[PDB]
Amino acid sequence: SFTGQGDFHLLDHRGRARCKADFRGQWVLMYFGFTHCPDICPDELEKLVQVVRQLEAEPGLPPVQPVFITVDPERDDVEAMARYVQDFHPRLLGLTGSTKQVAQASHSYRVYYNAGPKDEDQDYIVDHSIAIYLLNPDGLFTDYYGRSRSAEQISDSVRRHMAAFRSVLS
Ligand SMILES: [Cu+]
């Protein structure tokens, strides 16, 4: 008795907070990042935006909506997300939160990011190991992508992930 649908809750880049249930009826691309990457995110977000724009051009392919998610709150803001979305394009979506969100999400859904020690000198932040995930139109996941790729492998992989997950109404 009760559901309780394997939920989640994050802040919207305009000062609200969105639940798992709103995103139903879409394909959604989940990206784990932070508002201060030097030279990985400004490749990959533009690289993925070119794949999203290919799927605006090519008829019958899935409407892949991106979300960018902050992995640590000690350097972010909802107003920083609001810029990080819009100065790329208003088709972006920015999501943020705090410890008892991101920790209980990670306890429910185990995934890699490296919290490091330090003592005296002192570079290092957190490793964000360039993986992304496909969330789908009932609030379930399909599979992963990333590690090292570029648009020509992505559009064919999104076509193959589509041909695996399927429609129905066939
Ligand atoms: Cu990055």
Curated annotation (Swiss-Prot):
Result, substituting R24W: In MYP6; uncertain significance
GO annotation, biological process: eye development; in utero embryonic development; intracellular copper ion homeostasis; mitochondrial cytochrome c oxidase assembly; muscle system process; respiratory electron transport chain; response to activity
Keyword Nucleus: no
Location in the cell: Mitochondrion inner membrane
Gene Ontology molecular function: copper chaperone activity; copper ion binding; protein-disulfide reductase activity
Tissue: Ubiquitous.
Membrane disposition: Single-pass membrane protein
Residues noted as binding Cu cation in the record, renumbered to the chain: C37, C41, H128
One cellular component (GO) term of this entry: mitochondrion
Topological domains, Mitochondrial intermembrane: 4-170
Keywords of the record: Cardiomyopathy, Chaperone, Copper, Disease variant, Disulfide bond, Leigh syndrome, Membrane, Metal-binding, Mitochondrion, Mitochondrion inner membrane, Primary mitochondrial disease, Transit peptide, Transmembrane, Transmembrane helix
Reported effect, R16W: In MYP6; uncertain significance
S-S pairs: C37-C41
Domain annotation Thioredoxin: ranges: 4-163
Top-level taxon in the UniProt lineage: Eukaryota
Major subcellular site: mitochondrion
Family membership: Belongs to the SCO1/2 family.
Subunit description: Homodimer. Interacts with COA6. Found in a complex with TMEM177, COX20, COA6, MT-CO2/COX2, COX18 and SCO1. Interacts with TMEM177 in a COX20-dependent manner. Interacts with COX20 in a MT-CO2/COX2- and COX18-dependent manner. Interacts with COX16.
Chain's role: Copper metallochaperone essential for the synthesis and maturation of cytochrome c oxidase subunit II (MT-CO2/COX2) by facilitating the incorporation of copper into the Cu(A) site of MT-CO2/COX2. Could also act as a thiol-disulfide oxidoreductase to regulate the redox state of the cysteines in SCO1 during maturation of MT-CO2/COX2.
Record: disease: Mitochondrial complex IV deficiency, nuclear type 2: An autosomal recessive, severe mitochondrial disorder characterized by hypotonia, global developmental delay, hypertrophic cardiomyopathy, lactic acidosis, gliosis, and neuronal loss in basal ganglia, brainstem and spinal cord. Serum lactate is increased, and laboratory studies show decreased mitochondrial complex IV protein and activity levels in various tissues, including heart and skeletal muscle. Most patients die in infancy of cardiorespiratory failure.
Record protein name field: Protein SCO2 homolog, mitochondrial
Part of the full-length chain shown: 100 to 266 of 266
